[model samples]
Target: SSHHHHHHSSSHMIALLAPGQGSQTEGMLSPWLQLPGAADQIAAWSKAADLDLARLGTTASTEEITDTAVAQPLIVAATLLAHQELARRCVLAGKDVIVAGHSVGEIAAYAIAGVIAADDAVALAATRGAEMAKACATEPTGMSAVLGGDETEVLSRLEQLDLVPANRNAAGQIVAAGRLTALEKLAEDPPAKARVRALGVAGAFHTEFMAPALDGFAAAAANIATADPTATLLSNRDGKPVTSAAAAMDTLVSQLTQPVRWDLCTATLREHTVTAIVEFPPAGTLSGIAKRELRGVPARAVKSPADLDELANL
Candidate 1:
């Protein structure tokens, strides 16, 4: 009774997965910017975000780039860059493609599905990041990953510690978020079969701790032009396909103060019979998770324009 064995791809379905905030690293976008129009795109996005995202991606410090405001749009912009490049090299239209993005990655995901324009996508992400960063400052809360624990025991322990299971990242991993003090205790006295590692996050994400961010983030997205997804777009709310633009925005807003159900999102991938998976720039993370969770499926982590060669395999 394991999650891996029963999963098998019977068709040529490919899932384009995007990583969330924590997936970023300093200078991850440095290599991807070499492509044509990349500079102008970043320039416009910088204008949209009201920050020098180019400098941030190319030369900013770890601490500087780690700002939620910068990371969200930077990651989204980098992903769109790679996504456009992929379109150049491959016949994406009418392909058996399904897409989902993790947490902050959903902005790019919506853009990929044609639910929103790229400029608007990056702008919305920047605003969400700013608002969420504000929320993170409201309290000294944080999050940690509890690796390899019995689900029931882990939930009980987190509940006892007054922590929220902010992410059900599938099978072996669940991220706990709340007070920094409680997170320290979680690491000090972990549940049986689990090891806790504190995340390098500003505060508790996807919980009431992020409640303050909802209004501003939601308002920023409200007036943006949206359309029904051109490609299947899975939602983090319940890991189901959101075919309409209205529901897509609904899920985007709802995901703020709710735990991410990436496990369910991946399950939908299995049920949809995905043969391959692709992760956007600042990649590897989601692909690694898919390799582990999706067992027989192959994954491509597009770390740079160079990785586009593997698109033929899909």
Candidate 2:
């Protein structure tokens, strides 16, 4: 059965947003790129990373890109490619786009908004992944999901471990950041009703553990030319629209050491009078989050060629 949503009771144009980490998969766009001219269209990205673009869809590149070693370019390539296909499909051709992205997906959002070309975004992501990978080598940090825990108790526990709250996904789901050893401590002393499990990432993201990585990425982002998003560009830092390039760049880098206020991001959607939200590529996750976090909103995740037709009706 096709996924269905209750029509939002509003008159405003909707926002089209993208997700960030913990939302990737191997071969995400392999079939999409198999369309005529798609390979040639995305060939430049293959040069940026020394990997078989075809292998990326197979088991080999899946493991390769899972590491920060190859994950960055792969994600940028896939998301940017998907954005291009969206352009060709004219899904947002006439819509009043209120575009936003979460964490790494911000680059994809920027490209879609014309602030940065797709190729440039991919190159930047490649550099970003490598730089952060190097930084992770210095400190053994990671992320963990805190399920069914009180936010106050979770925050208190993170404070005791010198960790940081990285993401607030939904009512009972929050992600925390800390050193690998520290996360182990959290598991041992988990808050009541909390179930904590470590994430498979290179380093602790969006925590004090990223102070050095934040500095490094900040320096790199300064040299890049970013323009204000062509439409509403909400900051993951606090979910407010960032209308300046300099400020946007700063927040993009600072996000490495700050919690992503997804609760606030969803709040911005309702406040702006959004009618519906379309999530790209990955299915179920973001829409599920929106349902839990936003209470009353029409959310859909477009994951396959078929969903495009249904989305046009929205």
Candidate 3:
């Protein structure tokens, strides 16, 4: 029963994409907690994350889990937990695996790639979330979506308005982040054919507004032990293979003030020759991106415990 084989559904490469925030659901952990020691494992991560992860993932309300400290690490924990379990039930030998994540989810990807320890990664993410939250409160700045716009024109528009395209998420979608008043200007008038909708996020991230948060996360990242990646780890900085442990650590610190090149990250997944993709819990969003951005590469989100059997048995 423990024996398993890798089938690409066509080719031989598989990818695991980690999700960022905004993909969580209440009680998402109830199913996974049934597995042995899952509860105690989350408890250990809770001490590292400095928040009650078990409560947040199981019994906590959406509002309670939405805080930066709570949301960031919780998503990381759930994503890692699912993947950890996926590896156990599904023996994925012979099929090449590459790992990447968007925004905070990259922390989870780091652990999957063996660039850092899981518990330490959770603690570092907790610090990142809390510090970024403080950076948000220190300034009157935020991020807004500029969707379905002329790409070149969108950059020009944001530039003229003195705002940064904080996230170049896809071909048609970019995030404008900067002073709240400047963001208002972008909303009042946007790039041709583009619609501007302010996000529910508290402040401008992936921009200079987050410099304060970067210093803290950078320090924490430095203090942690690291290993060279055991698998292909792509960088959010440019969608390229991280190359080494130091490079991965550098991007973790630098990406805080730099735009997330998810568009580029997904764009390059094709080059990896990944024939299929599986996203861990708190999934869906990145899987959808893979569908649209990397067409022909079949993707699945292992959203719940039930989804696991469906994948390996297929």
Q: What is candidate 2's lDDT per residue for 55-133, written digit by digit as tens? A: 5744554556677656766666666666666667766544566777776777777776666667767766766677778
lDDT of each: 0.86, 0.71, 0.83
Question: lDDT tens digits, residues 161-245, model 1?
Answer: 9998898987988999999988999988898878988989888999999889999998988989988777889998889999789
Worst 10 residues of 2 by lDDT: 1-10
lDDT, candidate 3, 24-95, per-residue tens: 787778888878868888999998777878777888887776677788888888888887887777546666
* Per-model TM-score versus the true fold: 0.94, 0.88, 0.93
The C-alpha stretches of model 2 lying farther than 4 A from their native spots are: 1-10, 49-54, 58-61
lDDT value, residue 175 of candidate 2? 85
Question: What ordering of candidates by lDDT runs from best to worst?
Answer: 1, 3, 2
Clashes of 1: 0
As a whole number from 0 to 100, the lDDT of residue 203 in candidate 3 is 85
